[PDB]
């Protein structure tokens, strides 16, 4: 009954993640002034360049140069020696208003509760009782390894670290009637951008002793665990200089690390009317409510929409065999307890609040008691 | 035991899909001259602009202006009245060489069979016996609806059609010991860009009579099927003018429509050393070989890699309860029959051949007998 499963995560300076954080810094800057801003901000990053492309209709006055540069500064790209510098990079803006054809079909002259979905699409939510935060251990550990790298970079413990990093964790699990039980960590990968002076052996030793051992419980590590630390051998060129980044290219890192399911939509740079984000947050809220409510040990929820239509077109449940109730009975409980119209989700999850940049690294789920992480008490 | 499931697809002129097709036109242009080109081409599309950003190291001499414009011409954006014109749009190029740090860690001075993975990551393959092509009916139908729109646009049957489209299909299924059996189509969405002259009722009638009825078998449609045809009411502004597009933003449309699983990596614009593409193709080949070989009715395969390491770090199997063999026995059969090193996948699947633009619309799987769609005969 044992099996392996692998998930990855990336750091704040991974170029795709830089784009997600900038897109959400732009969204938050608009929402601080106009809670009803319509935002669809894509970011592209390559050597020396941040380009903003997309559609924004808002009453806010946003200084894009300042917002972008402050986000890059926070990430830590502040000198040409690191491959990217917020002070001197090019910031290009190609932002237009939201299409009036979309606006008239989605929200113009509509009661807020009855606003249409901002697009068609499908979205999923997942929760698992294997961790207290109801997330897969593989992705939790992968995120925490990147967070540890950023912490040691920022506190000057490992001054050779740079912001761009990737991690990957393979866990060996057992299964019990559809629920999963972590046994041990089988393999860990860490790749992190570094300065020209540090030796490979010094980095590998520090990654094992100061990063992995500070994150992963010793009970999961043994003489057979496989470590791939700086496996490329050299990672001096990094950030956008090493690899072009785009918003919405880390959608599996943002969610469940390959567990559960994904409908394809990106989260960052989008206001609540874009159901790719709001309905995925609501589906996570449903799934976590079912698991914390004791109905399931793990569960997957699908929802779907049509542009301009408020009610979901479909809702579906997969309980992995971890409920005494059938999937039909769980679906009836979901329909009795949740209203997944976007104009109701916005109110339940407070989605006009400018907290989005906080979601744009280390996963959107299983952290910080955001509204979609506070279970709803179910009536049935 | 009945349940709903929804998948979507998009047309050739959807702005994200335009980017995937351009990225793969660039990859094919390089491979036509240099089978060993290292390509990581991202495309961004917005009003009047195609930007290429990424990393290419190749001996080819490629005219990017010509390759991009020819791809846009093929899609059908050939006049400012349609919102985008290959003849007059801006083509911007921000392409640099592949990082020498990546090159030395992945492929320099390595025997081809022993080349390292081009990145870390996780990838999945899926197959289901519900259709002869071993794909979910939801996504097959969604793709065929977009293909039908493009066919009627190109043959002049519906001259008001423009290239940008989206479709979505919800199927009601029954289940039989983990396998799925389609019963009926519950809901269909179609949104397609159109000219200024055609009436909404004329479009809705044509979409039902000439598109849906020409694609979906009548046995799946009944008086209760729900149709959302042009649900926004107006879609004149479209293509990149209506919504910025990026490469690798339709990864679920490219794969299984939400069924199976996804590791997050995009396919388009990448050569075989980028395991996000090559190992996902190989995992599809494994899954389809298990189902066509009669071992499973449906199956999911995960594989994962570390940058610079040739052998996968992990391989895992989920058979949904549709095999008499355990997942451990199926995994042993996979390990005995397949070698998922990227330097072996390239040979088995002929991945230096310039056929990639053909994959970049209507899904990478279940079509055209590409090498990953030809099952391997298994020995056990
Ligand atoms: C390996 S690059 C992707 C392939 C790349 N576009 C190419 O031209 O081959 C993807 C990510 O890996 C990381 N990376 C970049 N350079 C690296 C190196 N030398 N060693 C390890 N990882 C690296 C960065 O996080 C980067 O965003
Ligand atoms: C609805 S747009 C996404 C949201 C958009 N970025 C915004 O500013 O609100 C996503 C896709 O839907 C399609 N689309 C664009 N305009 C549309 C319209 N008026 N009606 C229906 N679908 C439309 C196009 O395929 C487009 O790429
Ligand atoms: C459909 C789907 C999607 C995503 C993940 C899984 N999935 C999972 O939830 N449970 C696993 N167990 C308990 C054996 C499992 C093992 C291997 C693989 Cl490849 C996937 C697995 C399933
Ligand atoms: C883990 C995972 C990922 C993706 C899809 C599914 N999955 C599926 O394979 N089979 C379904 N059956 C048979 C009931 C199903 C029904 C509802 C939902 Cl939300 C998902 C379903 C499962």
**Minimum CA–CA partner of B44 in chain A:** A44
Ligand 3 centroid–CA B261 distance in Å is 8
B29 part of a folded domain: no
> What is the layout of strands, in order, in the sheet containing B245-246?
B90-96, B49-57, B38-46, B245-246
Q: Which residues of A touch B55 (CB under 8 A)?
A: 243-244
- Residue B221, in any domain of the structure: yes
| Protein residues whose CB sits closer than 6 Å to any atom of ligand 2 | A 40, 55, 98-99, 101-102, 105, 118-119, 307; B 14-15, 164, 166, 191, 232, 234-235, 238, 242-243
- Contact assessment for residue A258 and residue A268, using Cβ atoms and an 8 Å cutoff: no
B244 and A187 within 8 Å at the Cβ level: the answer is no
* Residues 6+ away with beta carbon under 8 Å from B259: A261, B5, B7, B126, B128, B136, B138, B139
Q: What is the CATH number of the domain that holds B224?
A: 3.30.300.10
Q: How was this structure determined?
A: X-ray
Best substitution site from B5, B261, B296, B300 to test ligand 4's pocket, by max atoms within 8 Å of Cβ? B5
For B149, the enclosing helix (H) or strand (E) is helix B137-154
Q: Of B242, B261, B307, which is closest to A258 when you measure between CB atoms? A: B261
Q: Given the DSSP bridges, would you call strands A161-176 and A78-79 parallel, antiparallel or unpaired?
A: unpaired
Q: What is the helix (H) or strand (E) element at residue B350, kind and residue range?
A: none
Grouping H, G, I as helix, E, B as strand and the rest as coil, residue B7 is strand
Contact B27, B278 (CB under 8 A): no
The neighbouring-strand residues paired with A92 are A51
- Ligand number nearest CA of B287 is 3
Query: Are A232 and B54 in contact (CB < 8 Å)?
Result: no
* B252 in Cβ contact with B262 (< 8 Å): yes
Nearest to B233 by CA among A121, A311, A107, A102: A102
Neighbouring C-beta atoms of residue A79, cutoff 10 Å: 12
DSSP string, B176-212: ETTEEEEEEEEEEEEEEEE-SSS-HHHHHHHIIIIII
Whether residue A97 contacts residue A38, with contact meaning beta carbons closer than 8 Å, is answered with: no
First and final C-alpha spacing in chain B: 34
CA distance from start to end of chain A: 34
In sequence order, the β-bridge partners of residue B125 are: B301
Per the domain annotation, does A366 fall within a domain?
A: no
Residue B243 appears among annotated catalytic residues: yes
Positions at the binding site of A:
14, 16, 42, 55, 98, 164-166, 232-235, 243, 249-250, 266, 270, 274, 276
What are phi and psi for residue B27, nearest 5 degrees?
A: -60, -50
Is B90 exposed, middle or buried (CB count within 10 Å of its CB: 0-12, 13-18, 19+)? exposed
Whether residue B297 is contained in a domain is answered as no
Binding residues of B, as ranges, are 14, 16, 42, 55, 98, 164-166, 232-235, 243, 249-250, 266, 270, 274, 276
Q: Does ligand 4 have an atom closer than 6 angstroms to the CB of A258?
A: no
- Decide if A166 is catalytic: yes
User: How far apart (Å, rounded) are the C-alpha atoms in residues B47 and B43?
Assistant: 13
Helix (H, G, I), strand (E, B) or coil at A123: strand
Largest CA distance in chain A: 65
Q: What is the DSSP letter of A376?
A: P
Rounded Cα–Cα distance for residues A174 and A182 (Å): 6
β-pair type (A3-10, B179-194)? unpaired
Give the residue from B249, B255, B257, B364 with the most A CB atoms within 10 Å of its CB, the best one to mutate: B249
Which own/partner pairs from B318-327 qualify as long-range (CB within 8 Å, at least 24 positions apart)?
Answer: B319/B178, B320/B178, B320/B179, B320/B296, B321/B177, B321/B178, B322/B177, B322/B178, B322/B179, B322/B296, B322/B297, B322/B298, B323/B295, B323/B296, B323/B297, B323/B299, B325/B295, B327/A3
Cα angle vertex B164, ends B162, B169, to 5°? 115
Residue A172 inside a domain? The answer is yes
Which of A83, A227, A268, A314 should we substitute to test contact with B (largest number of B Cβ atoms within 10 Å)? A314
Pairwise CA distance, residues A28 & A60, whole Å: 11
Distance between CA atoms of residues B18 and A128, nearest Å:
37
Query: How many angstroms is it from A74 CA to the middle of ligand 1?
Result: 22
The shortest C-alpha distance from B349 to chain A (Å) reads 25
**Which of A94, A168, A309 is closest, CB to CB, to B120?**
A168
Could A121 and B96 be called an inter-chain contact, meaning their C-beta atoms sit closer than 8 Å? no
Q: Please state, in angstroms and rounded to a whole number, the distance separating the CA atoms of residues B240 and B246.
A: 10
Atom of ligand 4 nearest to the CA of A300: 19
Is residue B259 in contact with ligand 4, taking CB distance under 6 Å? yes
Ligand 4 centre distance from Cα of residue A336 (Å): 21
Active site residue A16: yes
Domain annotation covers residue B359: no
Neighbours of B232 (CB within 10 A): 22
Centre of ligand 3 to C-alpha B188, Å, is: 29
Query: Which residue blocks in B197-354 are alpha helix, DSSP H?
Result: 200-206, 213-215, 239-242, 275-292, 327-337, 342-348
Known catalytic membership, residue A14: yes
Is the minimum distance from the CB of B302 to ligand 3 under 6 angstroms?
yes
Distance of CA A367 to the CA centre of its chain: 11
**Contact yes or no for A216/A257 (Cβ under 8 A):** no
Q: Nearest CA of chain A to the CA of B100: how many Å? A: 8
Q: Which domain holds residue B149?
A: 3-9+137-238
Beta bridge partners of B169: B7, B188
**Does A47 fall in a domain?**
no
* Residue B313 CA to its chain's centroid (Å): 25
Task: Give Cα A19 distance to the centre of its chain.
Answer: 12
The verdict on whether B271 is a catalytic residue reads no
**Closest ligand 3 atom, residue B260 Cα:** 1
A223 C-beta neighbours (distance < 10 Å), count: 4
Kindly tell me the sign of the dihedral angle through the C-alpha atoms of A291, A292, A295, A297. Answer: positive
Resolution (A): 1.1
Longest dimension (CA), chain B: 65
CB-CB contact of B140 with B273 (8 Å): no
**Could you say which of B20, B34, B276, B373 is catalytic?**
B276
Q: Which atom of ligand 4 is nearest to the CA of A327?
A: 14
User: For chain A, how many structural domains are there in total?
Assistant: 1
Task: Tell me the helix, strand and coil percentages in chain A, rounded to 5.
Answer: 35, 25, 40
Identify whether A377 is part of a domain: no
């Amino acid at each position: 009954g044992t099996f392996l499963f692998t998930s990855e995560s990336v750091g704040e300076g991974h170029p795709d993640k830089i784009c997600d954080q900038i897109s959400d810094a732009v969204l938050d800057a608009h929402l601080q002034q106009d809670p009803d801003a319509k935002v669809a901000c894509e970011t592209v990053a390559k050597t020396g360049m941040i380009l903003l492309a997309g559609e924004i209709t808002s009453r806010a006055a946003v200084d894009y140069q300042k917002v972008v540069r402050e986000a890059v500064k926070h990430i830590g790209y502040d000198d040409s020696s690191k491959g990217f510098d917020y002070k001197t990079c090019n910031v290009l803006v190609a932002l237009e208003q939201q299409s009036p054809d979309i606006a008239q079909g989605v929200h113009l002259d509509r009661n807020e509760e009855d606003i249409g979905a901002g697009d068609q699409g499908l979205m999923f939510g997942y929760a698992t009782d294997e961790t207290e935060e109801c997330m897969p251990l593989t992705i939790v550990l992968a995120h925490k390894l990147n967070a540890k790298l950023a912490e040691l970079r920022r506190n000057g413990t490992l001054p050779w670290l740079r912001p761009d990093s990737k991690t990957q964790v393979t866990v060996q699990y057992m299964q019990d009637r559809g629920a999963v039980l972590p046994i041990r960590v089988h393999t860990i990968v860490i790749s992190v951008q570094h300065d020209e002076e540090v030796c490979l052996d010094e980095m590998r030793d520090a990654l094992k002793e100061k990063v992995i051992k500070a994150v992963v419980p010793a009970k999961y590590l043994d003489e057979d665990t496989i470590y791939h630390l700086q496996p490329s051998g050299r990672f001096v060129i990094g950030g956008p200089q090493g690899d072009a980044g785009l918003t919405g290219r880390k959608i599996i890192v943002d969610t469940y690390g390959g567990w559960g399911a994904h409908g394809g939509g990106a989260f960052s740079g989008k206001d609540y009317t874009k159901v790719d984000r709001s309905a995925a947050y609501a589906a996570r809220w449903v799934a976590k409510s079912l698991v914390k409510g004791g109905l399931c040990r793990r569960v997957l929820v699908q929802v779907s929409y049509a542009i301009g239509v408020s009610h979901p077109l479909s809702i579906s449940i997969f309980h992995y065999g971890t409920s005494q109730k059938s999937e039909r009975e769980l679906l009836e409980i979901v329909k009795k307890n949740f209203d997944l119209r976007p104009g109701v989700i916005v109110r339940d999850l407070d989605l006009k609040k400018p907290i989005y940049q906080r979601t744009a690294a280390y996963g959107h789920f299983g952290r910080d008691s955001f509204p979609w992480e506070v279970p709803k008490k179910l009536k049935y």
